[PDB]
From a paper:
The NMB0736 gene of Neisseria meningitidis serogroup B strain MC58 encodes the putative nitrogen regulatory protein, IIANtr (abbreviated to NM-IIANtr). IIANtr is a member of the mannitol-fructose family of IIA protein/domains which forms part of the phosphoenolpyruvate: sugar phosphotransferase system (PTS). PTS controls sugar uptake by bacteria through a series of phosphoryl transfer reactions in which the sugar-specific IIA enzyme is phosphorylated on a highly conserved histidine residue by the histidine-containing phosphocarrier protein, HPr. The sequence similarity between HPr and the molybdenum-iron protein of the nitrogenase complex of Rhizobium trifolii and the frequent association of PTS proteins with rpoN have been taken to suggest that IIANtr may provide a regulatory link between carbon and nitrogen assimilation in bacteria.
Analyses of re-dissolved crystals of the protein by mass spectrometry showed that only the un-phosphorylated form of the protein was crystallized presumably due to labile nature of the phospho-histidine bond in the acidic crystallisation conditions, 0.1 M sodium citrate, pH 4 (data not shown). The model of NM-IIANtr contains 146 (out of 149) protein residues and 72 water molecules. Residues 1 and 148–149 are not modelled in the structure due to lack of clearly defined electron density. The structure of NM-IIANtr consists of a 5-stranded mixed β-sheet which is sandwiched by six α-helices, two on one side and four on the other. The overall fold, as expected from the sequence homology, is similar to that of E. coli IIANtr (34 % sequence identity) and IIAmtl (23% sequence identity). The major differences between the neisserial and E. coli structures appear at surface loops linking the secondary structure elements, for examples α2–α3, β3–β4 and β5-α4 loops (residues 34–40, 70–75 and 107–112 respectively in NM-IIANtr), and the termini. The active site of NM-IIANtr is located in a concave area of protein surface consisting of α3–α4 and β2–β3. The active site residue, H67, the equivalent of H73 in E. coli IIANtr or H65 in E. coli IIAmtl, is the fifth residue of β3 and is surrounded by hydrophobic residues L69, I65, L114, L117 and A121 on one side, and by hydrophilic residues R51 and R69 on the other side. The side-chain of R69 is folded toward the active site H67 unlike the corresponding K75 of E. coli IIANtr, which is folded away from the active site H73. Interestingly, in our structure there is also a strong peak of electron density located on the 2-fold crystallographic axis, which could be modelled as a sulphate ion interacting with the side-chains of R51, H67 and R69 via salt bridge/hydrogen bonding, as well as to the equivalent residues of the symmetry related molecule.
Numbering used by the authors: 2 to 147
The structure:
């Protein structure tokens, strides 16, 4: 529901050429920059402070990098489809091509676990991951993710 107001078409990338996970994270800071009240450097540190604890990869080419910060007052996200898979240090050893990033304010945690939990559910389905890997438009991506 709120996933829709959090993922506009302007926050979706369909064919990003990226070589490293570090690179992927830098590009994310840029996408979520300022519209989150934070500089891309701060958005980056926030996502990496968490990735530090361990890979946010869910297994099977999917991942959900995320972070919280007192400066964020409204949840915001983005979706990335890589041209080539990226070594994500995932739980099953396979690289990732589908990345959903989420930046949340530091307040309504419980509600956030909901968004993450629901998303993971969608990603656990083979046919959903297969669609996200073939659809041509960003609108199709949104339709599937919602």
């Amino acid at each position: 529901s709120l996933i829709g107001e959090i993922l506009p078409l302007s926050h979706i990338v369909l064919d990003m050429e990226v070589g490293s996970k570090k690179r992927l994270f830098e590009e994310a800071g840029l996408l979520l920059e300022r519209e989150s009240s934070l500089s891309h450097a701060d958005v980056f540190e926030c996502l990496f402070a968490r990735e530090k604890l361990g890979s946010t990869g869910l297994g099977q080419g999917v991942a959900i990098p995320h972070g919280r910060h007192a400066g964020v007052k409204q949840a915001t996200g983005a979706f990335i489809r890589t041209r080539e898979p990226v070594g994500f240090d995932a739980p099953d050893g396979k690289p990732v091509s589908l990345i959903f990033i989420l930046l949340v304010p530091e307040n309504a945690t419980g509600e956030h676990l909901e968004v993450l939990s629901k998303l993971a559910g969608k990603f656990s389905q083979k046919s959903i991951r297969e669609s996200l890997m073939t659809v041509s438009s960003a609108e199709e991506v949104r339709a599937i993710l919602t």
